[PDB]
Amino acid sequence: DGAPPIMGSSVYITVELAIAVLAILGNVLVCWAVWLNSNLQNVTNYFVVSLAAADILVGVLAIPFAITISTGFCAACHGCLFIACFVLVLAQSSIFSLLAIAIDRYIAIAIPLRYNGLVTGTRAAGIIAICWVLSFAIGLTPMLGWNNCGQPKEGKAHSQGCGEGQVACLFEDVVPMNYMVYFNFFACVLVPLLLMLGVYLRIFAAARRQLADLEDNWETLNDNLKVIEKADNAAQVKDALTKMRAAALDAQKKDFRHGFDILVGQIDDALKLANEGKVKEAQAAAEQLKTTRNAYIQKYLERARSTLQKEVHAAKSAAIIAGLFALCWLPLHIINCFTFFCPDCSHAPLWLMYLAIVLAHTNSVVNPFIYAYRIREFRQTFRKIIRS
Ligand SMILES: CC(C)CCC[C@@H](C)[C@H]1CC[C@H]2[C@@H]3CC=C4C[C@@H](O)CC[C@]4(C)[C@H]3CC[C@]12C
Ligand SMILES: CC(C)CCC[C@@H](C)[C@H]1CC[C@H]2[C@@H]3CC=C4C[C@@H](O)CC[C@]4(C)[C@H]3CC[C@]12C
Ligand SMILES: CC(C)CCC[C@@H](C)[C@H]1CC[C@H]2[C@@H]3CC=C4C[C@@H](O)CC[C@]4(C)[C@H]3CC[C@]12C
Ligand SMILES: CC(C)CCC[C@@H](C)[C@H]1CC[C@H]2[C@@H]3CC=C4C[C@@H](O)CC[C@]4(C)[C@H]3CC[C@]12C
Ligand SMILES: CCCCCCCC/C=C\CCCCCCCC(=O)OC[C@H](O)CO
Ligand SMILES: CCCCCCCC/C=C\CCCCCCCC(=O)OC[C@H](O)CO
Ligand SMILES: Nc1nnc(-c2ccc(O)c(Cl)c2)c(-c2ccccc2)n1
Ligand SMILES: CCCCCCCC/C=C\CCCCCCCC(=O)O
Ligand SMILES: CCCCCCCC/C=C\CCCCCCCC(=O)O
Ligand SMILES: CCCCCCCC/C=C\CCCCCCCC(=O)O
Ligand SMILES: [Cl-]
Ligand code: NA
Known part of the structure; x- marks a missing residue:
């Protein structure tokens, strides 16, 4: 009673490609706006550009990788591990950018007299470079040995005609679920998001005082x-x-x-x-x-009141971006928790996995819309780029 797998695969692949096009177009526009408008060239927007670069790479690389790993094609296990783990690098880099933006806004609201001396563009570029290196280290940690390549599913590999040393390339077959839940989700995603929540609570409390x-x-x-x-x-x-x-x-x-x-x-x-x-x-x-x-x-x-209200408005726009990241990525992590913590529960069905993956990828589309609807300088610059 199994319908041809290429039918459901075609829907998933078509949706992914549509998301990739939109993620590239919208975030390229973000980068082009900051490059052109000097009023948009500040430390806060350098992390915005770093966040847009991660979303561009979601459409150029992570989504083609996700399409590839959905086929279960035969591949050298560590090669499969790389294309499966690369999205973890981009997600981690996004988290670092989101946390830096929150901290940047807290410094501006709490100590504005020494903000320009403490938070500079040169130091921001160095922080961005460091966060990208740490994102590769965190996201590619399975390539350091914490993987399932030592225990391949040989029955699945033989049934697909894979060669020696090859496996059917599937995410959950090579990436360990204890890495995904304890290390990636709890330590590297949940904890930074809770830190961001605490920073934003301090921002709004400082503005209210x-x-x-x-x-x-x-x-x-x-x-x-x-x-x-x-x-x-x-x-x-x-x-x-x-x-x-x-x-x-x-x-x-x-x-x-x-x-x-x-x-x-x-x-x-x-x-x-x-x-x-x-x-x-x-x-x-x-x-x-x-x-x-x-x-x-x-x-x-x-x-002075007008300046504080504009900082509150800008902090809410940044917090919406961080909240939407959490909303789009949490279903994937919650599903992994069910897979990991409840072995007596049936695995989430394949269509739900695809839906959770598509939802995570859609987060790479939403930020340019938040900037356009909430930040006038971005919106006006977007109009000038598109009209010209
Ligand atoms: C500069 C950028 C654009 C280059 C991108 C390089 C990408 C496309 C390359 C780099 C390493 C490559 C992987 C390395 C090893 C393997 C194992 C093999 O059994 C199947 C292909 C596979 C899984 C490759 C797929 C393509 C790959 C991910
Ligand atoms: C921008 C440039 C400098 C990036 C260079 C990345 C290179 C050095 C890395 C990225 C991914 C790596 C590959 C990932 C996985 C495999 C599968 C394994 O069975 C043999 C090695 C091989 C094929 C790796 C070779 C080196 C590799 C291609
Ligand atoms: C506000 C957002 C972040 C909440 C997201 C809630 C989602 C991810 C939750 C709510 C209900 C959950 C499902 C409830 C029951 C089951 C049956 C079990 O055999 C496999 C997991 C599965 C299918 C769960 C997967 C995750 C799930 C769909
Ligand atoms: C959103 C932030 C604030 C907290 C994240 C909540 C996560 C960690 C919680 C919410 C719902 C929880 C799940 C709810 C039900 C079950 C079924 C049980 O048999 C094993 C644990 C398991 C699978 C839980 C694991 C942890 C879980 C996924
Ligand atoms: C400007 C763009 C910058 C650079 C853009 C790069 C885009 C990468 C696209 C696809 C990667 C998919 C690669 C994986 C394809 C694997 C298929 C395969 O390897 O099949 C034979 C194998 O032995 C199975 O039996
Ligand atoms: C999972 C693997 C985790 C890896 C764990 C270890 C990683 C190293 C961590 C941080 C290095 C911080 C960067 C230090 C680089 C020098 C910075 C510097 O020289 O600048 C001081 C400056 O004067 C003031 O503005
Ligand atoms: N079980 C499972 N399966 N697939 C993915 C997966 C693979 C490629 C992607 O492009 C995306 Cl978005 C998701 C994840 C997963 C969950 C959370 C964070 C990263 C990966 N977890
Ligand atoms: C206004 C901007 C227009 C940009 C056009 C982008 C439209 C993307 C639509 C579909 C992408 C996929 C098309 C063909 C997929 C083949 C399906 C398959 O064989 O798996
Ligand atoms: C701007 C550059 C963007 C890169 C273009 C890449 C677009 C191609 C899309 C998806 C790649 C699909 C990989 C093929 C799956 C292998 C199927 C199999 O071998 O069984
Ligand atoms: C395998 C990597 C694991 C260890 C991570 C190391 C941390 C990042 C290392 C080097 C980043 C280089 C850029 C540092 C310049 C700092 C500029 C500045 O802060 O003003
Ligand atoms: Cl505004
Ligand atoms: Na992102």
């Missing part, structure tokens, strides 16, 4: 102004002014500096009048602070 701090200093500026107006002695004016002077410097950490120079100076003017017991003169001097607040301080408040 900084936006709260901005609003607290703005309220303290306006509350103590009311305290001075309804004060009854010079000591009460002095108490409210001392809190404003420290909060003004706390919020200060050309037109920006001039606005705060006026503010602290006007606070000092009113403070000197308060220390001399001149309540009415100190209150009138403190009323001049409202002119500085409307013309300078509120504009800084708004611009």
